[PDB]
């Protein structure tokens, strides 16, 4: 028995975060291949969101590793399809990514608060180490992208930012 | 308009195959982290199924790329959770992998047959090039693993094969 | 006598594809030096279409090699001059290239269907191997160029796409 | 059970091809050492036919591998001795090699047709990938050798072609 | 005329040895691909017997070379199919290889004795140089393999010896 | 006293062989400088026979070394001048070389037989090791040269073979 | 059972040669450390005979390997102490080594004759390959050493030959 100081509600919270990270990965994968569609044809955004999909899947596997490390049991659920089939302009998609990352951030903060309420000092630090600052940096990056995409405007500016910044 | 000689039924079969490859990726991910659970503790199998999960996800993205190349539209669905939460012995899991890969193979053969019935010569060759021989090779490899896992037996043999062959 | 399983109608189809590939090469050569004219002065497009002209001539020589390999006889015809003397905007020329490549694709698919109706298994696979996927990729690329050229607009955007993408 | 979409008549056809490839290997071995006989003494042809014998044995082993990959059973038969004990002039031998490769080509085309009639998409593609174009190229090469051997004539020409081309 | 001190019964004996070496090569090929069958799945034995098949074919070609060197005439016969279609356990197969190599050894000793009775000093030395010690060493190696296969036992031991020693 | 199991008749046969190897060396030297005469002017043959002369002289010194190793006494005789002053065509000379090498071979076989009749096991193996297979190989090479020189014919062929093969 | 064409008297002869080679090794070891004694102090001879002792032990192990290779049974006997405790002058010791090597040579020739009388063609060639010429060369070398040691004389010459030749 390796389980120690690991509450069953914390364990359920981890399984729930695993699903949410997979959901984000699937959403960024949808975004990536939307921008690869010939009627959209923004290759920098295709690369940017494909990499984001890879990273979210890595986040899910980190949480699965943690579940096993602490002596919990991974329980998987359906990965719901993304909210949209097509994602509009480049700015629209980055705005949707900002909304999603803020939703993931709030879910991570609630998980941290739950672990903390149960005295799980190692879990709290683990969440801080691998997730909380990474989320803050991703959110700041997405916000900057939105401000710049507003600045460059439609048409030539969207092509330029796609190629020079996202790609 | 880039679409040419690409039938709407073939397009729907590609969207179906995308979902099935993702379902396989999720099943192998479940298997991989089952073998990482401390009550199982087979590290070679963890590595082997994690890599299979990566590959199936790559198969899904190849089909997504093909959907776009031919002028179709990707439509994603929920990725159903895997059939089991735990996978038994190493041989049980390899047997479950074999059954899944044969299900995937029949789905690909059916997709090929449909494309062929619509005169889609490029789609048929594409499926042959990227999937049909790869599937034959994976099934032969899984069959051989099952025969060897029967030969080495329970206990020390399972440890040895996990470490010396799968890992 | 090396000729085996090679129908006289297949042979005539190959001679006809040889002429069409040469016609495409001549058309891209016209496009390339139109963009080199001082009243147009788009050097990226000059390079892009010069390379496309080289590749179409390579396609014709592949078919001539195949004709000889199967024991047919090459019969050449006049290479008709291109449909236009000047090609308009950059987007107009890429649209004309998309139309031409789709016409070449349909001609290749008809050639494949003819060979298949005569049981010429090697010819069908040869056409798949060297032409059918290459055509699909060229058509997707041209479509993406058109979507991007629409996005960047007239003037500065056409200069930019010419230099940063086509060149 | 790995066997899937693999018809028993296809399996018997593969076993027949294995014997024919081994028969071809044995014939080229006979040719090779005929040319090593001191009353013949053509060292370039010795090397050329010895290599052809090696390759035909590789073809046999590819088909044995394929038989196992698809879940069939290899059944071997006698390898019949070659049709002749001595092979005449260099041109005579290359002419006999051409006749044999066309016989093997027809056998491969009949095997492909049989597989296609049973809907074995992977087998057809495997035969195309490993044998059909390979066979077209070998027949063209043998045809060209016969034309050149006719051109160079008896005596000095035969010595020269043996040394400068076959060797 | 290069023939010197080369008896016609020696020449017929060399032709007989050529067929026996080719028969041995064919038997080891059968063994090799029996072990590649998915119901057997012993990859080390596949590689070990494939190499033995190559070497026996080299032995055949050495004797063909010798026949030509001495001014004899090579006369080939059918290569009879191997005695079995399947070869049992790894130990069974190595035991059958030992029986075959002892049969080949006795044939070589009878060939040496025949040559010696005709005063063919060079032939006797050639057989000693290329075959007799080579054969003693192969028999000793096969004997040691059988003893070790008995020692390691069924199951895990067979897997281990196949992988660590034969492979 | 080092002499052991070395019969006086074997010793006299070694002294006889020493003289015959020297006679061969002198014959090939004559041939070599015949082909260097300006009325013949075949430089490849000059090089080829000069090297054969060097080798035969090395054979004589090996036998001299062996005479001393076994405790015999070297006794030298006149080296008789070669049978001819001029050697005709390139084929004539190679034919004369073949006859001489077969005479040398019979002399070596007779020497082996004598040693064997005296129980000199080491001398027999020594003759086998240094001479009997070397002689078989030289005779086969000379036979092949004669066959090729017949194939290439007079004039241009003789020039070509001299330069491309002998030189 | 690996034993084939290996007579029980041959086997007994091999066991007997094993003992004789060990006896020679022990004798050269005695010689080597005699010359290392401070009242003798010939360091070149110490090295020379130490190496000879190593080689004779290697000869014994070759014969033990051969016994096992042919399926005999090694049976060891006492290694008798050397005939002398001290070996006189340097020339006296080399004379004793010559006598011993001639005794070993005669024993090897008798072993060869016995094997030959039983038709053991491989054994005869093995003895020739590893022993008979090596013995002839060692005997010639020892004889030369004795002639030179006579030439250089007592005192300074013995010191010089010891250092410049044996060491």
PDB file of C-alpha atoms in Angstrom, chain B:
ATOM      1  CA  UNK B   1     -13.088  24.299 -55.537  1.00  0.00           C
ATOM      2  CA  UNK B   2     -10.463  21.578 -55.091  1.00  0.00           C
ATOM      3  CA  UNK B   3     -12.875  18.659 -54.576  1.00  0.00           C
ATOM      4  CA  UNK B   4     -12.696  16.194 -57.471  1.00  0.00           C
ATOM      5  CA  UNK B   5     -13.815  12.530 -57.689  1.00  0.00           C
ATOM      6  CA  UNK B   6     -14.379  12.541 -53.899  1.00  0.00           C
ATOM      7  CA  UNK B   7     -17.743  10.991 -53.004  1.00  0.00           C
ATOM      8  CA  UNK B   8     -19.789  12.212 -50.039  1.00  0.00           C
ATOM      9  CA  UNK B   9     -20.063   8.647 -48.710  1.00  0.00           C
ATOM     10  CA  UNK B  10     -16.271   8.218 -48.796  1.00  0.00           C
ATOM     11  CA  UNK B  11     -16.027  11.543 -46.938  1.00  0.00           C
ATOM     12  CA  UNK B  12     -18.387  10.274 -44.224  1.00  0.00           C
ATOM     13  CA  UNK B  13     -16.406   7.039 -43.956  1.00  0.00           C
ATOM     14  CA  UNK B  14     -13.220   9.054 -43.405  1.00  0.00           C
ATOM     15  CA  UNK B  15     -14.898  10.965 -40.580  1.00  0.00           C
ATOM     16  CA  UNK B  16     -15.931   7.604 -39.126  1.00  0.00           C
ATOM     17  CA  UNK B  17     -12.378   6.260 -39.397  1.00  0.00           C
ATOM     18  CA  UNK B  18     -11.002   9.378 -37.687  1.00  0.00           C
ATOM     19  CA  UNK B  19     -13.222   8.640 -34.685  1.00  0.00           C
ATOM     20  CA  UNK B  20     -12.194   4.967 -34.573  1.00  0.00           C
ATOM     21  CA  UNK B  21      -8.463   5.760 -34.689  1.00  0.00           C
ATOM     22  CA  UNK B  22      -8.973   8.201 -31.806  1.00  0.00           C
ATOM     23  CA  UNK B  23     -10.915   5.537 -29.899  1.00  0.00           C
ATOM     24  CA  UNK B  24      -7.988   3.151 -30.390  1.00  0.00           C
ATOM     25  CA  UNK B  25      -5.517   5.805 -29.221  1.00  0.00           C
ATOM     26  CA  UNK B  26      -7.574   6.303 -26.057  1.00  0.00           C
ATOM     27  CA  UNK B  27      -7.789   2.552 -25.441  1.00  0.00           C
ATOM     28  CA  UNK B  28      -4.015   2.138 -25.694  1.00  0.00           C
ATOM     29  CA  UNK B  29      -3.521   5.135 -23.389  1.00  0.00           C
ATOM     30  CA  UNK B  30      -5.752   3.410 -20.824  1.00  0.00           C
ATOM     31  CA  UNK B  31      -3.742   0.203 -21.194  1.00  0.00           C
ATOM     32  CA  UNK B  32      -0.450   2.102 -20.883  1.00  0.00           C
ATOM     33  CA  UNK B  33      -1.350   3.740 -17.575  1.00  0.00           C
ATOM     34  CA  UNK B  34      -2.964   0.557 -16.258  1.00  0.00           C
ATOM     35  CA  UNK B  35       0.475  -1.062 -16.538  1.00  0.00           C
ATOM     36  CA  UNK B  36       1.921   1.987 -14.710  1.00  0.00           C
ATOM     37  CA  UNK B  37      -0.389   1.380 -11.725  1.00  0.00           C
ATOM     38  CA  UNK B  38       1.640   0.157  -8.752  1.00  0.00           C
ATOM     39  CA  UNK B  39      -0.468  -3.018  -8.384  1.00  0.00           C
ATOM     40  CA  UNK B  40       0.530  -4.016 -11.939  1.00  0.00           C
ATOM     41  CA  UNK B  41       4.000  -2.465 -12.365  1.00  0.00           C
ATOM     42  CA  UNK B  42       4.971  -3.604 -15.871  1.00  0.00           C
ATOM     43  CA  UNK B  43       7.111  -0.744 -17.250  1.00  0.00           C
ATOM     44  CA  UNK B  44       7.878  -2.248 -20.662  1.00  0.00           C
ATOM     45  CA  UNK B  45       4.163  -2.620 -21.386  1.00  0.00           C
ATOM     46  CA  UNK B  46       3.537   0.926 -20.196  1.00  0.00           C
ATOM     47  CA  UNK B  47       6.059   2.187 -22.764  1.00  0.00           C
ATOM     48  CA  UNK B  48       4.780  -0.111 -25.518  1.00  0.00           C
ATOM     49  CA  UNK B  49       1.122   0.910 -25.214  1.00  0.00           C
ATOM     50  CA  UNK B  50       1.927   4.597 -24.730  1.00  0.00           C
ATOM     51  CA  UNK B  51       3.752   4.491 -28.079  1.00  0.00           C
ATOM     52  CA  UNK B  52       0.819   2.643 -29.689  1.00  0.00           C
ATOM     53  CA  UNK B  53      -1.443   5.399 -28.360  1.00  0.00           C
ATOM     54  CA  UNK B  54       0.783   8.050 -29.967  1.00  0.00           C
ATOM     55  CA  UNK B  55       0.734   6.170 -33.301  1.00  0.00           C
ATOM     56  CA  UNK B  56      -3.062   5.781 -33.384  1.00  0.00           C
ATOM     57  CA  UNK B  57      -3.406   9.512 -32.732  1.00  0.00           C
ATOM     58  CA  UNK B  58      -1.030  10.071 -35.681  1.00  0.00           C
ATOM     59  CA  UNK B  59      -3.288   7.818 -37.790  1.00  0.00           C
ATOM     60  CA  UNK B  60      -6.246  10.036 -36.878  1.00  0.00           C
ATOM     61  CA  UNK B  61      -4.363  13.176 -37.919  1.00  0.00           C
ATOM     62  CA  UNK B  62      -3.301  11.599 -41.233  1.00  0.00           C
ATOM     63  CA  UNK B  63      -6.976  10.976 -41.993  1.00  0.00           C
ATOM     64  CA  UNK B  64      -7.824  14.536 -40.950  1.00  0.00           C
ATOM     65  CA  UNK B  65      -5.129  15.784 -43.320  1.00  0.00           C
ATOM     66  CA  UNK B  66      -6.527  13.590 -46.108  1.00  0.00           C
ATOM     67  CA  UNK B  67     -10.083  14.855 -45.516  1.00  0.00           C
ATOM     68  CA  UNK B  68      -8.794  18.406 -46.056  1.00  0.00           C
ATOM     69  CA  UNK B  69      -6.566  17.470 -49.028  1.00  0.00           C
ATOM     70  CA  UNK B  70      -9.541  16.031 -50.915  1.00  0.00           C
ATOM     71  CA  UNK B  71     -11.838  18.950 -50.107  1.00  0.00           C
ATOM     72  CA  UNK B  72     -14.028  17.243 -47.527  1.00  0.00           C
ATOM     73  CA  UNK B  73     -15.045  18.618 -44.150  1.00  0.00           C
ATOM     74  CA  UNK B  74     -13.851  17.101 -40.876  1.00  0.00           C
ATOM     75  CA  UNK B  75     -16.692  16.410 -38.450  1.00  0.00           C
ATOM     76  CA  UNK B  76     -15.627  15.180 -35.020  1.00  0.00           C
ATOM     77  CA  UNK B  77     -17.630  13.115 -32.534  1.00  0.00           C
ATOM     78  CA  UNK B  78     -17.204  12.151 -28.883  1.00  0.00           C
ATOM     79  CA  UNK B  79     -14.298   9.788 -28.258  1.00  0.00           C
ATOM     80  CA  UNK B  80     -15.922   6.953 -26.326  1.00  0.00           C
ATOM     81  CA  UNK B  81     -14.104   5.786 -23.223  1.00  0.00           C
ATOM     82  CA  UNK B  82     -12.372   2.399 -23.506  1.00  0.00           C
ATOM     83  CA  UNK B  83     -14.266  -0.838 -22.982  1.00  0.00           C
ATOM     84  CA  UNK B  84     -12.473  -1.664 -19.710  1.00  0.00           C
ATOM     85  CA  UNK B  85     -10.999   0.211 -16.773  1.00  0.00           C
ATOM     86  CA  UNK B  86      -8.441  -2.530 -16.042  1.00  0.00           C
ATOM     87  CA  UNK B  87      -6.905  -4.913 -18.532  1.00  0.00           C
ATOM     88  CA  UNK B  88      -5.881  -8.059 -16.662  1.00  0.00           C
ATOM     89  CA  UNK B  89      -2.653  -9.826 -17.536  1.00  0.00           C
ATOM     90  CA  UNK B  90      -0.133  -8.715 -20.141  1.00  0.00           C
ATOM     91  CA  UNK B  91      -1.430 -11.452 -22.435  1.00  0.00           C
ATOM     92  CA  UNK B  92      -5.065 -10.378 -21.864  1.00  0.00           C
ATOM     93  CA  UNK B  93      -4.186  -6.833 -22.919  1.00  0.00           C
ATOM     94  CA  UNK B  94      -2.266  -7.944 -26.019  1.00  0.00           C
ATOM     95  CA  UNK B  95      -5.249 -10.135 -26.907  1.00  0.00           C
ATOM     96  CA  UNK B  96      -7.535  -7.110 -26.502  1.00  0.00           C
ATOM     97  CA  UNK B  97      -5.149  -5.084 -28.687  1.00  0.00           C
ATOM     98  CA  UNK B  98      -5.298  -7.810 -31.360  1.00  0.00           C
ATOM     99  CA  UNK B  99      -9.107  -7.806 -31.395  1.00  0.00           C
ATOM    100  CA  UNK B 100      -9.162  -4.016 -31.702  1.00  0.00           C
ATOM    101  CA  UNK B 101      -6.582  -3.927 -34.512  1.00  0.00           C
ATOM    102  CA  UNK B 102      -8.605  -6.522 -36.455  1.00  0.00           C
ATOM    103  CA  UNK B 103     -11.730  -4.412 -35.928  1.00  0.00           C
ATOM    104  CA  UNK B 104      -9.785  -1.397 -37.231  1.00  0.00           C
ATOM    105  CA  UNK B 105      -8.515  -3.511 -40.139  1.00  0.00           C
ATOM    106  CA  UNK B 106     -12.044  -4.558 -41.152  1.00  0.00           C
ATOM    107  CA  UNK B 107     -13.171  -0.933 -40.908  1.00  0.00           C
ATOM    108  CA  UNK B 108     -10.298   0.090 -43.221  1.00  0.00           C
ATOM    109  CA  UNK B 109     -11.067  -2.733 -45.665  1.00  0.00           C
ATOM    110  CA  UNK B 110     -14.714  -1.610 -45.692  1.00  0.00           C
ATOM    111  CA  UNK B 111     -13.623   1.991 -46.305  1.00  0.00           C
ATOM    112  CA  UNK B 112     -11.397   0.845 -49.177  1.00  0.00           C
ATOM    113  CA  UNK B 113     -14.279  -1.146 -50.678  1.00  0.00           C
ATOM    114  CA  UNK B 114     -16.558   1.896 -50.508  1.00  0.00           C
ATOM    115  CA  UNK B 115     -13.982   4.193 -52.133  1.00  0.00           C
ATOM    116  CA  UNK B 116     -13.390   1.564 -54.835  1.00  0.00           C
ATOM    117  CA  UNK B 117     -17.124   1.319 -55.535  1.00  0.00           C
ATOM    118  CA  UNK B 118     -17.142   5.087 -56.133  1.00  0.00           C
ATOM    119  CA  UNK B 119     -14.173   4.952 -58.539  1.00  0.00           C
ATOM    120  CA  UNK B 120     -11.891   6.842 -56.122  1.00  0.00           C
ATOM    121  CA  UNK B 121      -8.569   5.465 -57.363  1.00  0.00           C
ATOM    122  CA  UNK B 122      -6.457   7.929 -55.365  1.00  0.00           C
ATOM    123  CA  UNK B 123      -8.266   7.241 -52.087  1.00  0.00           C
ATOM    124  CA  UNK B 124      -7.841   3.486 -52.521  1.00  0.00           C
ATOM    125  CA  UNK B 125      -4.106   3.831 -53.133  1.00  0.00           C
ATOM    126  CA  UNK B 126      -3.824   6.261 -50.208  1.00  0.00           C
ATOM    127  CA  UNK B 127      -5.486   3.776 -47.864  1.00  0.00           C
ATOM    128  CA  UNK B 128      -3.220   1.011 -49.181  1.00  0.00           C
ATOM    129  CA  UNK B 129      -0.122   3.175 -48.818  1.00  0.00           C
ATOM    130  CA  UNK B 130      -0.679   4.390 -45.276  1.00  0.00           C
ATOM    131  CA  UNK B 131      -2.873   1.765 -43.605  1.00  0.00           C
ATOM    132  CA  UNK B 132      -3.495  -1.682 -45.128  1.00  0.00           C
ATOM    133  CA  UNK B 133       0.035  -3.099 -44.979  1.00  0.00           C
ATOM    134  CA  UNK B 134       0.719  -1.324 -41.665  1.00  0.00           C
ATOM    135  CA  UNK B 135      -2.348  -3.067 -40.234  1.00  0.00           C
ATOM    136  CA  UNK B 136      -1.262  -6.492 -41.511  1.00  0.00           C
ATOM    137  CA  UNK B 137       2.140  -5.968 -39.893  1.00  0.00           C
ATOM    138  CA  UNK B 138       0.705  -4.821 -36.554  1.00  0.00           C
ATOM    139  CA  UNK B 139      -1.630  -7.826 -36.409  1.00  0.00           C
ATOM    140  CA  UNK B 140       1.190 -10.273 -37.166  1.00  0.00           C
ATOM    141  CA  UNK B 141       3.315  -8.603 -34.467  1.00  0.00           C
ATOM    142  CA  UNK B 142       0.495  -8.826 -31.925  1.00  0.00           C
ATOM    143  CA  UNK B 143      -0.143 -12.464 -32.822  1.00  0.00           C
ATOM    144  CA  UNK B 144       3.545 -13.285 -32.312  1.00  0.00           C
ATOM    145  CA  UNK B 145       3.528 -11.496 -28.925  1.00  0.00           C
ATOM    146  CA  UNK B 146       0.552 -13.611 -27.815  1.00  0.00           C
ATOM    147  CA  UNK B 147       2.293 -16.842 -28.856  1.00  0.00           C
ATOM    148  CA  UNK B 148       5.455 -15.783 -27.003  1.00  0.00           C
ATOM    149  CA  UNK B 149       3.539 -14.670 -23.898  1.00  0.00           C
ATOM    150  CA  UNK B 150       1.926 -18.130 -23.824  1.00  0.00           C
ATOM    151  CA  UNK B 151       5.383 -19.685 -24.162  1.00  0.00           C
ATOM    152  CA  UNK B 152       7.005 -17.714 -21.333  1.00  0.00           C
ATOM    153  CA  UNK B 153       4.086 -18.232 -18.914  1.00  0.00           C
ATOM    154  CA  UNK B 154       3.037 -16.483 -15.718  1.00  0.00           C
ATOM    155  CA  UNK B 155       5.364 -14.813 -13.258  1.00  0.00           C
ATOM    156  CA  UNK B 156       9.033 -14.629 -14.221  1.00  0.00           C
ATOM    157  CA  UNK B 157       8.190 -15.101 -17.906  1.00  0.00           C
ATOM    158  CA  UNK B 158       5.776 -12.156 -17.930  1.00  0.00           C
ATOM    159  CA  UNK B 159       8.351  -9.959 -16.210  1.00  0.00           C
ATOM    160  CA  UNK B 160      11.031 -11.052 -18.707  1.00  0.00           C
ATOM    161  CA  UNK B 161       8.991 -10.526 -21.863  1.00  0.00           C
ATOM    162  CA  UNK B 162       7.748  -7.151 -20.627  1.00  0.00           C
ATOM    163  CA  UNK B 163      11.296  -5.961 -20.037  1.00  0.00           C
ATOM    164  CA  UNK B 164      13.233  -7.681 -22.846  1.00  0.00           C
ATOM    165  CA  UNK B 165      10.721  -7.431 -25.701  1.00  0.00           C
ATOM    166  CA  UNK B 166       7.977  -4.851 -25.092  1.00  0.00           C
ATOM    167  CA  UNK B 167      10.160  -2.255 -23.331  1.00  0.00           C
TER     168      UNK B 167
END
